[PDB]
């Protein structure tokens, strides 16, 4: 039924001695892997606790060992058997008693579901509980389960370790697999939650393995095909049992995989040679996490020394002896004493945990005893009355070294901290085909990257980033999809990227560079005489300089002879100065200064044109008045109209400021690499047209009076010469207006107007001086 | 200890017989108001259940009555006593037994905490529970408490009824008050949650009343001052006990309140005379919600007929007898038999609930027994093995009539539906000063609005809306603040409200209306001859029409006499037609047609103006050529230049399309109510200037020719007449430009330019008409 050990203070114990069988009977056959090994461990702990004078020197400690049969309902009935001893008041019945048996704590509930039940029924009666094999993450809410403590870390720490290895090694795609039950699902659920909470990682696959059958071998193909749908995902994490992973590896081998994606194992994978067989090539490179294992020396010596006639407190030892050696009292066994010789048994990894659990209880009880009373040699009555939340507080704040090297402690929640060591499988080049240690995880991940290569490869050989990092000079961040990985699209070539996250538009009037770092147009467009067509006008201007160097030559000496006296001296000075004025104007407009000095050039063509025609205007009137019927008088009237032209540009300056702007923008989207720039001063089509039209207005009033001049027998050569010039001048002016209309639609017209205007002035001036100088050469050759 | 009743099937019972006292002893004195009345009710129910052949005919029903002492820890020790009888297996001890007592259900846990605790310990063992006095809303989660049922509705239904009355009667501002414990806080929390879930209501105040002392009378002044801060909130809901509300009403009375805000009571307020004393004026109009009460006739007869020698099963009856009459075995009592005479006792309102609870349990067992086995007369063995979720399912699906008229049922959650009746206090017009019924609440609110009139006024007199309706013709919705109640602001005056929630800008070119419903401008601006200054030009045009009827009068007969022959005949016809053409132009431009007929008008001033000067042009040339040294030739040269004017409008037709637009926009923000509009065809400043400027060229040439013509000894009066007219027109043409520029900045110039143009055309013609008149009067006089 239950083992009873006498003592003034006792603690209970739940262990799965038997195993559940058919639906009818709660439990049938016995189990040796976890049934008797753990009981003997607890009994051994109590024996040496009572022997040790360091802990509880003057007070003894007892216990009540008991079994659960691995059933929730059976656990509840038994847990009530602890507490009824103190809760029952009395019984009004007689047959024709026993000590109260006050318990102080309970140690057990190895499973998960039985722990949840026992925690729920003992939370009400305020009795502390310490578990040793309950790894489910559900028993982690302090509010939900007040009185509960664990010496074994849950799966949440294991999931944290995996995501730390994935994060540190560098990966973005991970595929999760899980088996049936409450282990695989809770593992991946924690893994997903931590990844979402920490950020930077994502889940791309999530397949579930049912347990309706094991001899199908089709669902395995379904999942492996599902995992192969995206070749980029090369890392998978597994939470299944050993049989499942054995099947998956077999499927991968028979499928002749070409990607050979990496695995990440859980505690079920661990370090065991049984699962791997003929799959050593495909299982290579699998990172597995396993809890640290320690072997004690005291328990083994104790357990190997017990026999039937030595100890009788244990009620299930005889049945275990019968089942272990397979002999019943048709084979009989008497005094074999070969438990450690006939059977090659090895202690489990959880024996160290139950020994630590008993210790933590004994230490907290020991501190509570010392703090409550110190003036009493034995057991003070204050201890019996005090119990409940006080002992739980002492259990949380405990710190010591157990049977293993590592210490034991409890954090805020109440579970022991996680300590794992990472393993890896290497066979293609390693001296030993077995697993090799590569790192540990206690509080921060400590992993030797250079220690793992698994042959013919660097430690960072595999890549899984969901997108190749795009840095060819263009980048942009798109919100579409999961925030895990980013997609980059080529933005327009007319602007550069800002903060490596967006393509903002750069300020105008300048092209972007090639590497998309700055937006500036170094190249510019400038007018040149040699390269563009401006050479021909330049040659024409040079030719005009030669012409005026010959007209004015025969003027210095020929100033008093009675040959030039026929022409008026005052009129001769006007034409001499007018011819030189236009020669300087064409040279000025040809040149393109950057500074705002064109103001002195615009008057050369605006005001310099009037004085050229002024002498011709008064000359026509002078030769016509003598036909219809004071040289200083003709000088005055011409001087007056010069002032009109001079005042014309002055009032223009008062109308609007003479601001000079050299900046220009092409604003062409056809060729973003092209950058056309033009600089001009006071460039207005109306300004140049109206200023030039002033001469045309007075030329009309002069030509009309010249119709009657033709045929006068005064100077036949001179009269015929003037009439020839008039028709030529009207020709160039009549052709000038059509030019700018219907042609400014393009972008290269900024330099063509200047050239055509240049040759127009030279052509109009050459014809004027040609007829004027025609009679002058007669006195030279003749 | 506990009352035990024999039976093959039994159910347990928890009742608070005693009350907790000092810290040492768990419970001390007994309570009569809830201790013994409820037990005797349950015992009576069991007796008549066993007597009634309708339910469980061949099978009896027993029970185990037991007390809880109103302690959480004590309730646990008792619950274990129920469950141990069936869960315990055996006990290995001897002294030198009792019936198994299999329970099937439990009825009890009156309080709130003990119900939560008992529900927690029995949920694990899967034993159904029915409570009768647990009204807390926490016991309403089916997931948290599987095996739990209630015959008394929780407080959530009460909070729903209040918010339904506030919503139905129409209010928006409410203030919440609550007391200490787990009743007031949970009540208002539910009220707040339902208000937010249903919507349309808000909480403006939330004050909390501690319970550290009872003789301070200061905290009440603080809260009433807090509640008086906003005069708008005239409705408060209270969840406190009777002592608290008695103090608040006293505080309101001594504060001489002027707002007299309304109250809404809870179940604690109910319908009692204790809560009202000298405050009848200020408590008037308090809507209170109370559960329906019914009185049974069987229990009273049973309880009044029991005596010490009659019944012995009850173990606490003797102590109750001693405490009820206050006599101990220094006053002794023997055989009084005046329980119903010496004490004026009345049964509680919860007795009907325990009787319903016992019934629901009996019916569910009756159905389960009938459904499970029907071929056996007695108790079939299947019933003992069957238990757990099945009986719970049969308890949920039950429906019958209990001791009261109303039936009992359980909804999806497991708590009985709420059924209340609404009360109100009235003491001015009603003959009866007491409370009067005004409505009921079972599934939908049924309230008689016309039946309640508080404050000696109309029913719906008080309102609390946070704001007036604010519908003066325009409104805007503001998101600031709580969505419950809103603030309205006046938007700009130039647009109307859209969907009664926003002020969008209506299309321009018109004005909005006054009620903010439409955006259209009916009024328009049209030129009139009578009202504006256009009368004077109109009268001038009429004067010219009369004047021209005199020049042509002496022209038909005087065509062959040798007096008029001095003037050119062809010239006379030209000037005769020119005068009549201008007379028609001034009339056409005066009129403003809306139709597309202005094209025939513009030619009157475009082409009809040149023909007026055409005769004048050739007249001056004709008299000048004879001075420098063929009537048909003069006719041809004038006829040609008319064609140029005729072609002038032709090229204008092909240059731009004659699009006519009558719409106009003032775009003035100074007067939003003003709407100015002008309709004109082809309104361009340059068009009228250039068309009129063409005639200036020819007139200028005539002016210079006439100036040189002066002094010729050919005509005396005619030469003097033509000299003066050439000097008069230049003045008005020179002044036309100054008034044209720098004047159009306003908005009323659309019609002032026409008037001045009309007069200008008339006066420019009268000077010519007067010049022709002088020769006419001369020949008449001569």
Author numbering:
A (entry chain A), B (entry chain B): 41 to 136, 144 to 376, 387 to 686, 698 to 850
The authors write:
To address the mechanisms of assembly, we purified native membrane vesicles (NMVs) derived from cells expressing excess mGluR7. NMVs were generated using N-ethylmaleimide (NEM)/Ca2+ and those containing mGluR7 were enriched using affinity chromatography. mGluR7 clearly forms bulk phase clusters in the NMVs at these high concentrations. Selected proteins within the clusters permit calculation of a cryo-EM density map of an mGluR7 dimer. Using the single molecule translations and angles from image analysis and map refinement to position dimers in the raw images, neighboring pairs of mGluR dimers can be seen to contact each other mainly through the large extracellular ligand binding domains. The contact sites appear multiple, instead of being dominated by a particular pair of surfaces of the ligand binding domains. Micrographs with side views of the mGluR7 bulk phase clusters show strong protein density on the intracellular side of the NMV that does not appear in the final cryo-EM reconstruction of an mGluR7 dimer. While mGluR7 dimers contain only a small number of amino acids on the intracellular side, it is possible that other proteins from the cytoplasm—purified along with the NMVs—could mediate cluster formation. The mGluR7 dimer has twofold symmetry, and the contacts are made through ordered structures on the protein. However, in contrast to HCN1, there appear to be many competing contact surfaces in mGluR7 rather than a dominant favorable surface. Consequently, clusters of mGluR7 are not arrayed with the kind of regularity observed for HCN1.
We look first at the metabotropic glutamate receptor mGluR7, a class C GPCR important for synaptic transmission and neuronal development in the central nervous system. mGluR7 forms a functional dimer with extracellular domains (ECDs) responsible for ligand binding and dimerization (the ECDs in the dimer are disulfide bridged), transmembrane domains (TMDs) that mediate coupling to G-proteins, and short intracellular domains (ICDs) that are largely unstructured. Dimers of mGluR7 have been shown to form immobile clusters at presynaptic sites in neurons and the ECDs have been implicated in this behavior. Thus, the ECD of mGluR7 has been shown to be important for cluster formation in cells. But molecular details of mGluR7 assembly are not known.
